[PDB]
Amino acid sequence: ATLKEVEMRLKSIKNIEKITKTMKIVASTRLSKAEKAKISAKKMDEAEQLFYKNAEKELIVAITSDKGLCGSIHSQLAKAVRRHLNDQPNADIVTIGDKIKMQLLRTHPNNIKLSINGIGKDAPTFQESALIADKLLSVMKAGTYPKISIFYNDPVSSLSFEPSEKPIFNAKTIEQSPSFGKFNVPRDLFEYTLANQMLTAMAQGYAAEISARRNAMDNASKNAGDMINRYSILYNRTRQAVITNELVDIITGASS
Amino acid sequence: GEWFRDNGKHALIVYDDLSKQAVAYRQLSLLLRRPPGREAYPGDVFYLHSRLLERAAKLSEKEGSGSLTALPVIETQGGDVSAYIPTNVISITDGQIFLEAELFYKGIRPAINVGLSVSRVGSAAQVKALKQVAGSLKLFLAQYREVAAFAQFGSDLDASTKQTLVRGERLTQLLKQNQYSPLATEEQVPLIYAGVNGHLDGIELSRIGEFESSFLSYLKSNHNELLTEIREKGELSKELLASLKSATESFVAT
Amino acid sequence: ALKQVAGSLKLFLAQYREVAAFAQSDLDASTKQTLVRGERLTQLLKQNQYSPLATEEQVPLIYAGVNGHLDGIELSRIGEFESSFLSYLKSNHNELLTEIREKGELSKELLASLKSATESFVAT
Amino acid sequence: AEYFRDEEGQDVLLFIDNIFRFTQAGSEVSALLGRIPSAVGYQPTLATDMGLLQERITTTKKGSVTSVQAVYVPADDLTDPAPATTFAHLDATTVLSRGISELGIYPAVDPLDSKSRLLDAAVVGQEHYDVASKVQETLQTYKSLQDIIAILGMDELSEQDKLTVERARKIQRFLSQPFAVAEVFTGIPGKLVRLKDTVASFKAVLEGKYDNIPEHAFYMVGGIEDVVAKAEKLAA
């Protein structure tokens, strides 16, 4: 490549490295709160677990990141969840997050029946989650579903995550279970525990998104370095060549 | 051309191109065994192009008000403006129109790099109406050149930043032009007015080429007196601005 | 005398040179201590034009920086400390400065006396 | 060739391989003739030496001459004054590139440095011009996204940019073609494609009809019919 074009591409790469460094800084800032929230929600699920463990058509629920640059984890996990749920690919899907909406194409993309937006603008919380879930229950009869699959990323590692999904079910899932002897309370449960599991999955997904971004954006910044190095080597080799030609020019100028 | 200049007439001289002239003079100078300089050019190539270009002038009313305008062409090798002749000519001239191949292949023709292109005479040379409407155009394109590079990096962005892309892309599309089809300033003013003030924000980016084709046909057919005023007077009064806005919004309603 | 403390100073400055570049996300306690040390010492590395310092005076300052004493001072005042400290050393500890000049070594007695003086002034 | 043009009254083909060697020989003898070298060591008379030769090859009112000139590019440097001077004379120029043959593309012509004065809607028609412009625009967009792709990978492009990159890769491979002369060393039977078929195929590809086909199916096939046939063979 010509020296000028080399300079142009090298400047582009350097600018990209800077931008990715800034996004890495932002991700590392969010990381602490994200992990603490995920741990807190996982612990808080124990209240519903204490009953659900003893008591023991299709729908789709997607809870993923609102924006890209979340590494491959955010979109790939939801895509794999859709591929696994493709045993009933026509299930009505309620989609939260742009990445989850895109990953929904692994199943039938026309199954969409509800949508949400703005998940990425704030930390996970039940304040707006409750209103969104109430609108979802009004629009989709989620309170009577035999099996509605809600998928969210699992932060299995400090910098890694794996796909996960859970089925929300109607009151009859608890009221009809033979083990219920260990204890419309069932419908109050199908509301409260449904919302609690939704919040826990949302917090886990947020923690996974932030960890994956903190890892992947730093990986991008590190990858920038190798190509920048080799292009710097090429640039300096070109500088050597042009310097040699300039020396030749002045030598031929002096000799005559 | 200096005959036209000195007899009170106006002339435009294009040199296509001065680099080949410098090559020819370098040939002459080296076959005469004059001392070579940088790139084996002789010492006085700057004196050459300078005493050539300094002949472009605007003469006073006492001298006959004649003028000669020079558009020297220069061919850079791989965009290397650091070369000897490009440096000399860029130093001598009162400005530059800079053409880039990457813009050409992105479909931006006539490929003028609005960032590098500079006119040192500036707005004093511009027609008053186009000076009026085009006031913010440079600012929006300057913002766009940065924000587009930011956006291609893949970062999500706020709506205020997105608006910069919305107008910048459509302005860059609006400045495209077909060869051998120059537009009268009468016809340019409405297009820049529509683009700058955001009326095009509602048009699909790919369809902008249709708008510029149809809008003028509307103005020529339904608002001909407005165009006649823009041409004859060359400046926009408050009433002409109001009428132009009315016509622009009437058409954009589609 | 200067070597004894500067050999330790090098280590802290290198550690800060690493940590600050890393941190530029809460800091671990050791890294926070490293940052405090590094910037407090940087406030000693700064010096005014045409204002050279004798070794008798460099040694106590680098001593207060190395042993972490002046970590008890807000950095934005270290300069005001550094001068007054020396003046205090001129009044209450002249023997220590004279011994640093004459012998050029921080003997155990002189080293402990300097520690005592630094503690006294930092408390003051 | 001039005798055939002027006095036989005939259309003439004048292949020249390789006209850089004329300038190179002029350079080789230059120093012994006492001339002061210029630039990177070429003779001062380079420009006029090329001119007195090239302006003779021209078509005239007595006859038509079609001249194909192979031009060497020393050290792959298109800024070297010899090819840089040669560019000014030609009407149609196609730049073969090492960086493209390194991808296994043949004839390895660079689609964003080849240019011809006939690529004009008044000459080739509107359909041809639009197809060619869209092809070049797509390839240029892909070239501009090369570095971002290398950094972040395809997973982080916008849907529009991802589709553009995929279509650009398919277009780039579809530009390859096996020549009969190359059968000896490529091992692939030669193909010859009409201009109409070329325009229609690239229009169809740009319209997205064939976007479901794998990239590998577009490589070194010929027309779009061969793309479909090779897609069938690869699927089996």
Curated annotation (Swiss-Prot), chain A:
<keyword id="KW-0999">Mitochondrion inner membrane</keyword>
<keyword id="KW-0496">Mitochondrion</keyword>
<dbReference type="GO" id="GO:0005739">
    <property type="term" value="C:mitochondrion"/>
</dbReference>
<dbReference type="Pfam" id="PF00231">
    <property type="entry name" value="ATP-synt"/>
</dbReference>
<protein>
    <recommendedName>
        <fullName>ATP synthase subunit gamma, mitochondrial</fullName>
    </recommendedName>
</protein>
<dbReference type="GO" id="GO:0015986">
    <property type="term" value="P:proton motive force-driven ATP synthesis"/>
</dbReference>
<keyword id="KW-0472">Membrane</keyword>
<dbReference type="GO" id="GO:0045259">
    <property type="term" value="C:proton-transporting ATP synthase complex"/>
</dbReference>
<dbReference type="GO" id="GO:0005743">
    <property type="term" value="C:mitochondrial inner membrane"/>
</dbReference>
<keyword id="KW-0809">Transit peptide</keyword>
<keyword id="KW-0066">ATP synthesis</keyword>
<comment type="similarity">
    <text>Belongs to the ATPase gamma chain family.</text>
</comment>
<keyword id="KW-0375">Hydrogen ion transport</keyword>
<keyword id="KW-0139">CF(1)</keyword>
<keyword id="KW-0406">Ion transport</keyword>
Curated annotation (Swiss-Prot), chain C:
<protein>
    <recommendedName>
        <fullName>ATP synthase subunit alpha, mitochondrial</fullName>
    </recommendedName>
</protein>
<comment type="similarity">
    <text>Belongs to the ATPase alpha/beta chains family.</text>
</comment>
<comment type="subunit">
    <text>F-type ATPases have 2 components, CF(1) - the catalytic core - and CF(0) - the membrane proton channel. CF(1) has five subunits: alpha(3), beta(3), gamma(1), delta(1), epsilon(1). CF(0) has three main subunits: a, b and c.</text>
</comment>
<comment type="function">
    <text>Mitochondrial membrane ATP synthase (F(1)F(0) ATP synthase or Complex V) produces ATP from ADP in the presence of a proton gradient across the membrane which is generated by electron transport complexes of the respiratory chain. F-type ATPases consist of two structural domains, F(1) - containing the extramembraneous catalytic core, and F(0) - containing the membrane proton channel, linked together by a central stalk and a peripheral stalk. During catalysis, ATP synthesis in the catalytic domain of F(1) is coupled via a rotary mechanism of the central stalk subunits to proton translocation.</text>
</comment>
From Swiss-Prot, chain D:
<comment type="subunit">
    <text>F-type ATPases have 2 components, CF(1) - the catalytic core - and CF(0) - the membrane proton channel. CF(1) has five subunits: alpha(3), beta(3), gamma(1), delta(1), epsilon(1). CF(0) has three main subunits: a, b and c.</text>
</comment>
<comment type="similarity">
    <text>Belongs to the ATPase alpha/beta chains family.</text>
</comment>
<protein>
    <recommendedName>
        <fullName>ATP synthase subunit beta, mitochondrial</fullName>
    </recommendedName>
</protein>
<comment type="function">
    <text>Mitochondrial membrane ATP synthase (F(1)F(0) ATP synthase or Complex V) produces ATP from ADP in the presence of a proton gradient across the membrane which is generated by electron transport complexes of the respiratory chain. F-type ATPases consist of two structural domains, F(1) - containing the extramembraneous catalytic core, and F(0) - containing the membrane proton channel, linked together by a central stalk and a peripheral stalk. During catalysis, ATP synthesis in the catalytic domain of F(1) is coupled via a rotary mechanism of the central stalk subunits to proton translocation.</text>
</comment>
<feature type="modified residue" description="Phosphoserine">
    <location>
        <position position="101"/>
    </location>
</feature>
